[PDB]
Amino acid sequence: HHHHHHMILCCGEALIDMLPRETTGGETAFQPFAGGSVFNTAIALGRLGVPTGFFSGISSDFFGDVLRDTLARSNVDYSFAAISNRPTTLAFVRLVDGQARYAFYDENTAGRMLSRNDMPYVDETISAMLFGCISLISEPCGSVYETLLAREAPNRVMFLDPNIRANLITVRKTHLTRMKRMIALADIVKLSDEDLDWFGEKGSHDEIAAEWLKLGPKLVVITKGAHGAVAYTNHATVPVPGVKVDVVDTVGAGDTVNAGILASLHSQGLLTKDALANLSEDQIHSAVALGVRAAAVTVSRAGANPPWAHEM
Amino acid sequence: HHHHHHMILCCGEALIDMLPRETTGGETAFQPFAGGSVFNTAIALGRLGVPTGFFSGISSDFFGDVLRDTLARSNVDYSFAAISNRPTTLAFVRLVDGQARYAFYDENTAGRMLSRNDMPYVDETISAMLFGCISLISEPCGSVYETLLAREAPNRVMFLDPNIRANLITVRKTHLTRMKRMIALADIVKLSDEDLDWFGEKGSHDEIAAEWLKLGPKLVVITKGAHGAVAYTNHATVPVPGVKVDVVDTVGAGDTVNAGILASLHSQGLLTKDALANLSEDQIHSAVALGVRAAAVTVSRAGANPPWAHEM
Ligand SMILES: Nc1ncnc2c1ncn2[C@@H]1O[C@H](COP(=O)(O)OP(=O)(O)NP(=O)(O)O)[C@@H](O)[C@H]1O
Ligand SMILES: Nc1ncnc2c1ncn2[C@@H]1O[C@H](COP(=O)(O)OP(=O)(O)NP(=O)(O)O)[C@@H](O)[C@H]1O
Ligand SMILES: [Mg+2]
Ligand SMILES: [Mg+2]
Secondary structure, eight states: OOOOOSEEEEESOOEEEEEEEEBTTSOEEEEEEEEOHHHHHHHHHHHTTOOEEEEOEEESSHHHHHHHHHHHHTTOBOTTSEEESSOOOEEEEEEETTEEEEEEEOTTOTTTTOOGGGOOOOOTTEEEEEEEGGGGTSTTHHHHHHHHHHHHTTTSEEEEEOOOOGGGOSOHHHHHHHHHHHHHTOSEEEEEHHHHHHTOOSSOHHHHHHHHTTSSOSEEEEEOGGGOEEEEOSSOEEEEOOOOOOOSOOTTHHHHHHHHHHHHHHHTTOOSHHHHTTOOHHHHHHHHHHHHHHHHHHHTSSSSOOOOGGGO | OOOOOSEEEEESOOEEEEEEEEBTTSOEEEEEEEEOHHHHHHHHHHHTTOOEEEEOEEESSHHHHHHHHHHHHTTOBOTTSEEESSOOOEEEEEEETTEEEEEEEOTTOTTTTOOGGGOOOOOTTEEEEEEEGGGGTSTTHHHHHHHHHHHHTTTSEEEEEOOOOGGGOSOHHHHHHHHHHHHHTOSEEEEEHHHHHHTOOSSOHHHHHHHHTTSSOSEEEEEOGGGOEEEEOSSOEEEEOOOOOOOSOOTTHHHHHHHHHHHHHHHTTOOSHHHHTTOOHHHHHHHHHHHHHHHHHHHTSSSSOOOOGGGO
């Protein structure tokens, strides 16, 4: 086993986004792009210069090759991932009558059919783990990821990004109970206002954050689009304004906020459970502001294309 | 139940071929094309003006819509098909170092997961049925198609197009025994020289055709690329020369030969088991020559794009 040098290990989906493009012959085709929210977060972390790892199910096929190539060039260690001959998850996007239509091809895929046997070896040189998004909806991988979070939560820092995609949730009740169990096990929870709306809880979003801070998390961050983010602890509330940019699109911007927060806490030497329980206003602001600043670069260009440290 | 007016019912795969194209931005994308060998044969039959039906598994999703739209515009009756919410089979093609690479995404698809419950209602107004190609390799659909052939063989004319795709055959022995059982139940068998090579039998291809004419078929046709085809019965051997054309590609050309043969036999009023056992040299030549002439149009343009009668 290799020393992972105080690594942040991202655990979750890697997929191919299949997006509509125009061919030379004036016909619609689908151009493949490496993607998946947790994948994007891992890419963003690597580009910020943090020691970064990725655990997922990845195919041996040519789409799997795309994913691995992208991870490698962003310096992400994906030795943790389970490789199999199952196909790669494909996410088709179309514009139909000025409205977005989605088709999710995830049958018996490398990513979906993870088993307990596939769980990574995690020693003291992993400082933190991140979970989130659609890898937690699907089965059997969702149960594997929840099990991994529950197994490792006592040992190191846990970050959860609910990142709700309701169109893929077939039974609300069952995903909601999983979210609550996983929030209870998280040290840091980051989500958008829209994410939070899906939980259907009472009161202002500030009030709900305060309630969640009684359930396990030491830090709750609510992202607010162009408006930045607000961070909540039991000792402080820290509003962080957005950065003004010329917007191309905002897809995957939240994935970069995850990276900025974790990268800053890493740099500050605050990635321990105990350190997180004692964050100062300055330490919180620094971490969420890096997430917000980094995410602003992403929204300034097409797709989830997170910033290199040297781009900032 | 509707009168199908002496219909030829094609039974087999419908899929999306995903082919490499250049985007305006100089990037590779995959353009979707309606396809599948048995689908192509049904399209070709419809375009030749023959009453034509199609039994398959087809998705309710947007790729399924492409398939249905294509069938409708070629006047094919697909009321027989089983519609489900399972995804559509995707066949990816790439050019890697001047060599063709294939990736077949067929997990839990509309086409693959057919059951006995899905088999069509077949009455006296169906004159013939056609089977073939990769729908016979996969399970469970392959068993369903073989069962349908065995059930209907005593009642009407059976056409088999082995159309071998060895890259998708995982166990040779099991597909070979299925081919032999289905050949035994066929009135007409058409295949290429390369198809025949895969059977690994002894002697000249003329000798092997003669052996198969002792096993059930009344007509065996071997296609020979630019060289046309040779047709074999117990009463005659009929060489049919190829038509010279400017070749674009030959993909799916064999599917049009199927259509031409069946369309001619339909027009001549020879689509009964008894009529096929008594074919004259002239009747054989007419049918195979239409297949060869029609296929020549297909090879004159990109992909499996079979000719309308009014194009000939
Ligand atoms: N219009 C904008 N202008 C500047 N920054 C933006 C804009 N929209 C989003 N951002 C940045 O991106 C962060 C996250 O965006 P936000 O819309 O809250 O996440 P999200 O809805 O979860 N996006 P996604 O990753 O696609 O799920 C914000 O906190 C900002 O820092
Ligand atoms: N180079 C050519 N020139 C003219 N006609 C051709 C040419 N190639 C094929 N054809 C026609 O297409 C028929 C079938 O082609 P052939 O190559 O024998 O089938 P195949 O190998 O089974 N093709 P496919 O449908 O892709 O499996 C031939 O009998 C010809 O009538
Ligand atoms: Mg948003
Ligand atoms: Mg050929």
